[PDB]
Each structure stands twice: as structure tokens, then as C-alpha cells.
Paper text:
Thus, U6 recruitment into spliceosomes proceeds though a novel, and poorly understood, RNA remodeling mechanism involving large-scale conformational changes. The core region of the U6 snRNP retains the unique “interlocked rings” topology of Prp24 and U6 snRNA and is virtually identical to previously determined structures of U6/Prp24 binary complexes, with a comparative r.m.s.d of ~1.3 Å. There are protein–protein contacts in the U6 snRNP that were not visible in previous structures, including a 660 Å2 contact between RRM4 of Prp24 and Lsm2, and a contact between the conserved C-terminus (or “SNFFL box”) of Prp24 and Lsm5 and Lsm7. The architecture of the free U6 snRNP provides insights into how spliceosomal RNAs can be remodeled in the absence of an ATP-dependent helicase.
In order to elucidate the basis for this selectivity, we generated U6 snRNPs with 3′ terminal phosphate groups. We also used RNAs with either four or five 3′ uridines to probe the structural effect of 3′ length heterogeneity inherent to S. cerevisiae U6 snRNA12. Nucleotides between the telestem and 3′ oligouridylate tail are poorly resolved due to an apparent lack of protein-RNA contacts, which likely affords a degree of flexibility to accommodate the 3′ length heterogeneity of U6 snRNA12. Inside the ring, RNA is bound in a shifted register relative to that observed previously. Instead of being bound in the Sm-like pocket of Lsm3, the terminal nucleotide occupies a new pocket comprised of residues in Lsm2, Lsm3 and Lsm8, and the penultimate nucleotide is bound in the previously identified Sm-like pocket of Lsm3. In this new “Up” (or uridine phosphate) pocket, Lsm2 residue K20 forms a cation–pi interaction with the terminal uracil and a buried salt bridge with Lsm3 residues D71 and R69, the latter of which participates in a cation–pi interaction with the penultimate uracil. The remaining contacts with the terminal uridylate are dominated by electrostatic interactions with Lsm3-R21 and Lsm8-K87, K90 and K92.
Numbering used by the authors:
A (entry chain D): 2 to 44, 69 to 84
B (entry chain A): 30 to 398
C (entry chain E): 7 to 85
D (entry chain B): 1 to 95
E (entry chain G): 26 to 71, 85 to 105
F (entry chain C): 1 to 79
G (entry chain F): 10 to 84
H (entry chain H): 2 to 44, 47 to 64, 87 to 108
The structure:
Amino acid sequence: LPLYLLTNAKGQQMQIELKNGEIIQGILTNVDNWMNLTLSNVTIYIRGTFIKFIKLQDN
Amino acid sequence: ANEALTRNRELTTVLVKNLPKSYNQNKVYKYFKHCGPIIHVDVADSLKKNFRFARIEFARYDGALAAITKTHKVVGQNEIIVSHLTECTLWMTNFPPSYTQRNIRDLLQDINVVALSIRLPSLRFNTSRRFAYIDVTSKEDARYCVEKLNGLKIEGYTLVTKVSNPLEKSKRTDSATLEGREIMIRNLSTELLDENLLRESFEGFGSIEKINIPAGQKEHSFNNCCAFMVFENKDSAERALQMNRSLLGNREISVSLADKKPFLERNEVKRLLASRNSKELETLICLFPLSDKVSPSLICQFLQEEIHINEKDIRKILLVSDFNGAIIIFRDSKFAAKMLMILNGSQFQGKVIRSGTINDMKRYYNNQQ
Amino acid sequence: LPLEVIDKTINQKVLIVLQSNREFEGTLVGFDDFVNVILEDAVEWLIDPEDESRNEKVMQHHGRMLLSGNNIAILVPGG
Amino acid sequence: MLFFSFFKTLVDQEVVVELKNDIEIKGTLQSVDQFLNLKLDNISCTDEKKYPHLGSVRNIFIRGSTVRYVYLNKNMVDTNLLQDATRREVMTERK
Amino acid sequence: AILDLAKYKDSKIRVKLMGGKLVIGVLKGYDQLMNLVLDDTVEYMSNARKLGLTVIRGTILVSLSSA
Amino acid sequence: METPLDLLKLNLDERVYIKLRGARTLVGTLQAFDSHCNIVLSDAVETIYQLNNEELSESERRCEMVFIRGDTVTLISTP
Amino acid sequence: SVTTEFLSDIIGKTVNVKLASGLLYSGRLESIDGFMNVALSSATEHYESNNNKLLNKFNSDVFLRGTQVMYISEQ
Amino acid sequence: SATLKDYLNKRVVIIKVDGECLIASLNGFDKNTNLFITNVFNRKEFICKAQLLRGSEIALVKDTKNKIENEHVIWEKVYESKT
RNA sequence: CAAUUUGAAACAAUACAGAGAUGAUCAGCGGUUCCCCUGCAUAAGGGGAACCGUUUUACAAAGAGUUUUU
Ligand SMILES: [K+]
Ligand SMILES: [K+]
Ligand SMILES: [Mg+2]
Ligand SMILES: [Mg+2]
Ligand SMILES: [Mn+2]
């Protein structure tokens, strides 16, 4: 359910924290099987292995 | 097609007699490959090792024709003879379940017949198949093999040996099921499990040849009983299917055509491979890779004799040839886990085999491709 | 294409930069699919982030080295 | 693999898991997978049960990559079978 | 793939790398594995050094955006 | 007796020495290992080296039978 | 292959093997596999350079995890 | 197999590899232990309702790293102590 | 709806005709992909691997929601 929760939520405002602590916010366009994350409206292509966790918004 | 492909084997296989002691498969290939593409070469020593025989199976009929022009040519200092292999093939069945190609070869060695080729069947679609074609070197030798081996009792099995001709094949003793003449009746009550009542209730459909009632059903006071009924002709079984969902006494019975063992075992394996359960799965292991010619008895003998497993520790052995493997179902998960460890890397039929879970078997197969 | 550049760098000097502050300058002998690199007569550097002058030469290698491509971040042809 | 089979033989045995973060958890091995994740039932911590972060938890799943040691008792292992199995695996050890 | 590097084939991109290093340069080319050819490359460490023409291994790339 | 791992199976049932992440060393009788260098040691003795200020402590653990996750293992030899 | 041919032609030579932690092993390369696991005879252990303080001298073969090997080079 | 089925839609204690806890309810998970949990909070304020935690960062449903002041000093001290 | 466990018993002699084996038993029809061989790096042909659509299922009872070898 994680991966398909990301590809079928193709468009929501999400809050990624990267492993260096370097936080990032924006709207997501595409998710890979590896959980690569392509985004815009940013504070970008992000390698999945470079994610710490993702705070989400909706439900 | 039973005369077509037989005329093709006869048509494209040649026998070479009197090759030099030094001639191996490679040299036979090198000598005959100019005749045409060769599918296979077997070389065997003569009885007294003074010369060699070859069986050469050519790709096309043109190869056999070209090969025969080499008859009576000289190889080394040997005058060779090349001929169509014809009327030189035996069909054998009901040898012991653990007889192997080496074992069959030793049988002919014992009655002094050189065997050029022993061909055993694939167990892909039926695990119980057990027969062999053997090409020998003369029609005389084939008739002698029949004379000495047809009817021989060996290790409890009375061997069947025939000059091979598929047109003369016997009706199997289980032919009624193959032919669609056996119905299975299910969900009878114990009160209804009686051959006379069953003949009376079903004989209107047609002449009944036989009724088989699995034993132990009345004696254990089963809720539901099953019975099998064989009709003399397929039309009778088909009309007997009318009784499905009908009432017999106070029991709604189900009636269907009896399934055959290979179908039933394969659906059992399909259930196993698709399982996401764990009580059943944790009691089994896989062995792989295995030839699709290796039968479950052969694997069982390996578990008892080399690994020293007790016969009553093995619940079931099923082939999974689509992954070059076999499943061994044991009685509990701890024994299964220990067997997984004991068996991995053991040697079977001179080759190292691996053990693992089903996913290990699948991964190994995918990785080899 | 990156790999065509790397291929075209064989027998030239190359600078191999790791994920850490470490680099190896040397003659590129060859590489494989996982971009493991064969270097000839490699200099090994530890690199100071602030001042490239207070960099530290860790060792002078002689002969050939296999540098695992696990850690290879950046390839600079010519050093 | 090998240790997967080893632990499946130790299922229903009481073990002590020491983790990379130094927490030790005594418990009953209930399941294991190809990554050597462990499901321990009825866990209890050793010596320093001082971590009210745990002990009240019925059954825990342990990520195999966070384990440092798994302590067992000699009664629990056939060392002949373990050494022999290793040698058989070892022939097969370039993965 | 997921991020089409072609739109960036002639502009300056910023690329973060696994070990903490940050790199800025003009994207000259790439492959399906996201290996990159960068020109006028400057390398920052965690402090800038100029390196010119370089090849970055796609395996250690952790984030990409426009410069 | 070919890959280094195979040579390690020659040390099975013999006394081994293991250096671990976290300033730690083990000695025990080698019962098992895989290609990740996970290891089962019997009659083991762990030794943790720590820094008390000026540093030098040496604590010790002993155990009958112990699984060791390969990813903490940095080197193996004999005592 | 150039890398495997290299491993082939350093079996038996004295080498330096530096780990990702920066620990450096010198000695005779008894064995290496495709994963760069290493066995070394007559191995010394230094941090970064042979010129630095000696950490261990080994009297039998030392085994090294291929996942931690950063480089192997002729000494 | 050791799956997280039995733990679905239930309150859980999570230990992260950094050595921080989270209390949550796990709606979904994959074979890489990516925790899809809801109603998360520190073991003690709720951080978010609905978040994806990455399997690499799950320790258990200090930190797991054992990096030290590079250790080599300790090893040479240990060497000379046995000399 | 499916998955699991069950009612429950798979008889009838083990065998009883080659990859010439088969029931979607490992199929058929329709379509997509990938690999290998020969071949002019053509074309065209062939033989080894996945996938999607569809065609198919005795009964009852329960019950059922590139991260992991630092
Ligand atoms: K057989
Ligand atoms: K189909
Ligand atoms: Mg039953
Ligand atoms: Mg073409
Ligand atoms: Mn029978």
C-alpha cells in the first residue's frame, strides 16, 4: 500500500525530510518503484534511498 | 502419426557396427557430420570390447541416406557396417520404480545384449510414468531380450518387454477413467453406501461394469461418503451426470466425471505454489534443480538411503518441473527446517542439489535463465 | 554519454573523487560495468573542504589499484 | 539460505536478542523471514528493564538489520549439523 | 524514466551527492542510469573547487534541480 | 578452499578472533557463517573497549552460543 | 573483466587493502572473490598509512568483508 | 515468514534507527518495511496524521549506528597495552 | 467476492507406449514485450523468456479484512 498510496496520490502537497535533515515541501508529479520523487513548488528529483520519511496531507 | 514419427525414427537413425576401439562420440561425429546435421550420437563398446557400435540420429532423412553410403568403408583398419536401425527397439515397462538408465543397461549386460540407447519419459505432465525404449544392436538381440525378460520377476515387479510398436499398445487397467466412463458420486450418507442400492439407482443410465467403494467409510461413521461407478460406455456415464444435485434417499448427491491422478496432483501443486498460508507450507521443503526425468520414488530412495530419513517422516512428494524442482512434505515444521539444512548441497545422481523454500526454488530458476 | 567519455579516458590521467573527502589521481587503466576502476601509479589524497592548499597527500601508490565503484562520486578526466 | 533454516529450527525457543542500539530483549521466537527479521512473542527485557518504552509490548517484530547478537544456549544446537551445513553452503558461497 | 533530463540538457543544474558533497554545473549529457556529463563543474564540500569537465556516477546522486 | 569464505570454512571448529564495529572483539569456536559473514560462535567471549576520559576500559561478556550479524563484522582471524 | 583479470594477476602478490573506515591491511593476498572479500597472509593493520601506528600484526590469514573494501593495490 | 499482518490498524510502538520512538497505527506496509502509519506522535505530541516512514529507518515494531571517534586510536592503545 | 480450515472419504493392480507427455495439468483465441540463432549492422526466417484481454470452476459448513549485511 505505501508505493501505490504515493503513485495514486499523484498531486498532493507533501513534506519530505531527507536523511541529511534537509527538509523539502512541494507538490508531487511522479513516483518510481524505488520511490523516487519528482516534485515542484519547492523549498526537484529526489532519489528514494535519500528519504527519511514523508509527512502527508489529506486523510 | 503413430506410423509417421515411427517411420521418421526408423528413417533417420543409423547403426554403425565395427568402429575402432579408439573411436568415441567425437570421432564418430567428425566422421559422419559431413553426411548432414546430426542430432545425436551414442557410442557403446561391443560385448567383448573388441570394437564399438554407434547410434547416430540425423536431423533429416538426407543424413541417414548419406550415412549409409559409408557402409563397408574402412575406419582405421575396421570394415564398418552402416544400416538403418529397424526392428531393433524394445519397449519395457513395469521395471522397479527405482530402476535407472544404468540399472536397465545392467539388465541387458546380464543377458549379454549391448544397449545403444535407453530413453525414458518426461514426468512433466504425469509423475507416475514408467517405461523405456531401448535400442539394441540387432533384431535377433531384441527378440532375445523379449524371450529372457518378458515376464521376469525383478525386485517384486514382473517386467513387461515387447518389441516396440505403439500400434499394439494394451488398454491400461485404469482405462475407464481415461475414457470418461467412471463417475464419482459424492456426499452419500453411510446408509446409502451400498453397492446394490447404487446399481439399482444408476443402472437405468446404462450397463454398469464396476462399483468401487473406498474402504473405511462406514466403519468410521463418516458424515459424507463417496463412491465410484464405472459404466460400460461413455454415453452412460454422461447421462448419469443427471443425478448431480438430485436426491438419492435423503441426501443430495453430487456426480461428476472422475478426475485422473495427474490432474489432481497438479492442481494440488498449483494450490501449494500459490499458497500464502503457513501451517502447510512450513512443513515442506523444495529440492532443485532436478531433471524432469526423476520420479518421486527415486527421490524417496535418495532420502532414505543417503540421508537416512525414515519412510514415515515423509508425508508426500510432488514434482514441480516448471521450476526444475520437487516438493517434499514432512510431518512438522521443525523436522522440515532441519531437513532443509541437512539436504542443502547434498549429492543426488552425482550432482549437487540445493534445498530451500518454494521462493528459493523459484529464484534459483529465474536466476539461471 | 558518460560511459563513452570514461572509455575515451583509458590510458589518460583521471581524477576519481569519492563520496568522502578523498580522491585518487592516476592513469586510468580500465573499468567494469559496476564502474570499478583500475588505476595506475595512483596518488591518494585526503581533501580539506576549506583550503585546497592544506590538503593531505595520504600515499603515493605504485603499480595498479582496484578502486571499488561503490564510493566513486565524480570522474574528472585529466586530473 | 542457512541462518534462516537455523532460526526456523529454533522457533518456539526462548532467546535473547541484543540490538545494534544495545537494547537486549528476552523473548520467544515466533517467526523468521529471508531477511532474518524476527517476531518475538511475550518479550521481556534483561537486567535493565528500565526502558518503559518496552516490556509492556506483547510481541515485537525486529528488523533483521537492527540486530547485533542473538544469544542462545548450547542445548539448543547440533553443532555437527551446523558445521556440516556451513561446509555444504560454503561450496555454494559465491552467492 | 521518471525525471526527463533532456529539458535540462543545456542549462545549469544543481546535484546533491550521497556523502554530503554539493555540485553545481551545466548539464551536457546523461544516460538512462542518470550518469551525467557536466561541464564547468564546481564542487562544494561540507569551500569550492573548480573541476571543469566531469562525469558523475548516477548511483550516488541524491537530488537534482535547476541551478 | 578457494574463495576467502571457503578458506574460512577451513577454520570451522577452531578458535577464531573477530573485530567488530564499536571497538569490540570476540573470540570463540566457529560453528557457522554465510556470505554476509553472519556467524555463529560457541563458547564466545566478547570484549568491549571503552574510553573513560583518559581511556582504557575493557569489559567482558561470555556466552554459550551466539549469533553475530555479519554487517557488524569488520575482520576475522585466529587468536 | 579487466578488473577480474587484475584480481587474477595479484593473487599471491603483496598488497595494500584499504577499507571504507580507512583501516589499511598489508600482506600477501591469499584469496579474493568477485565480491572483493579478501584473505591475507602475514597481514599488518595500520590506520591510513603503513607509516602510522601499528594496530595489529596477524600470524594467520585475515579475512576482510568485500562490502567494506575500498581499494586493493599492489604494494 | 515474519510479516506485519497481525499489527495492521492497531496502535504500535516504533523504534527508529536513530533511536527515536513513534506511537502510531499502521494501515499498510511493504516488503521493505515502509511504514504507512496514521496518528503518529513521539513516545509526546502528534507529529502528523498520515505519514510514510521509510523502512531503512525502522529498527523495531542510542541509534543502530556505532560510529565512534575513529576507533583507530583505541586500537593502537589496545595494541600497545598488549605489548 | 476471495483466502483459509473443514464435512472428506480419490477408489479402482503400481507399471501399462519417447518433448510421440497435458484437462487453462503447463490451454485456445486476440494482442504486447524481451532474449538468442542464422543473416548484409539488410531484409526475411526461426527457437527460448515473461505479460495483458478473454474463454473455465460438484456441494455444503465455518470463517474471514536504490532501504535488510552500517
Ligand atoms: K524412473
Ligand atoms: K491466456
Ligand atoms: Mg480430507
Ligand atoms: Mg535487424
Ligand atoms: Mn491406485
